[PDB]
Amino acid sequence: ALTQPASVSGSPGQSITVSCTGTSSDLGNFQYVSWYQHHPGKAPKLLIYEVSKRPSGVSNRFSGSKSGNTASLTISGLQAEDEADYYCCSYTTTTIPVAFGGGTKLTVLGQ
């Protein structure tokens, strides 16, 4: 399967890191896992494809890395509109061929 924490919070500006993991038997060698962001009332957009490859149009503050069975992303220099619904999508061979996160809702403490 595929799982991530339901919500995360921290100080504005910096100090945030979001991770996903899953069972290695269901996971087909762990390639082509992508990180997206969803906004309320807006269309979702692609941010990271295949762990640590940067597409065009994104900023350098987004980064992603995977160790062992767990993948994660970090972002530095947070802003007042950087609250997000960061999802991880991946391939699962035994069940339904695509798996879509567990739900995230980042909140800030600026107010």
Binding site: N60, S65, G77
Partner: protein, 98 residues
């Protein structure tokens, strides 16, 4: 051969490794993915420790973005939060990076 000298705050000596990030692996010294050579570490509580805290050592908490490996960040400058008009002194959303 090359050698360095550090004082690391406790548990993030484990994060000093070729490839994963951490607290001081993005705004401070980080190892590259092709790190030849390795880490010589020992518990020296005998010298770099004194009783009411040691404020003679400094570490960087944040930057504009991630820094490349084998780079030195020596520029000290007041850091604003994105778009706030704020320079010269500290205050709201303007903290020293040390």
């Amino acid at each position: 051969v090359y050698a360095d000298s550090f004082v690391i705050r406790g548990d993030e000596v484990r994060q000093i490794a070729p490839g994963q990030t951490g607290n001081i692996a993005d705004y401070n010294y980080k190892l590259p993915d092709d790190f030849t050579g390795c880490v010589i570490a020992w518990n020296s509580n005998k010298l770099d420790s004194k009783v009411s805290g040691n404020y003679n050592y400094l570490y960087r908490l944040f930057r504009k973005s991630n820094l490349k490996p084998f780079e030195r960040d020596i520029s000290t400058e007041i850091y604003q939060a994105g778009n706030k008009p704020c320079n010269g002194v500290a205050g709201f959303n303007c903290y020293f990076p040390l």
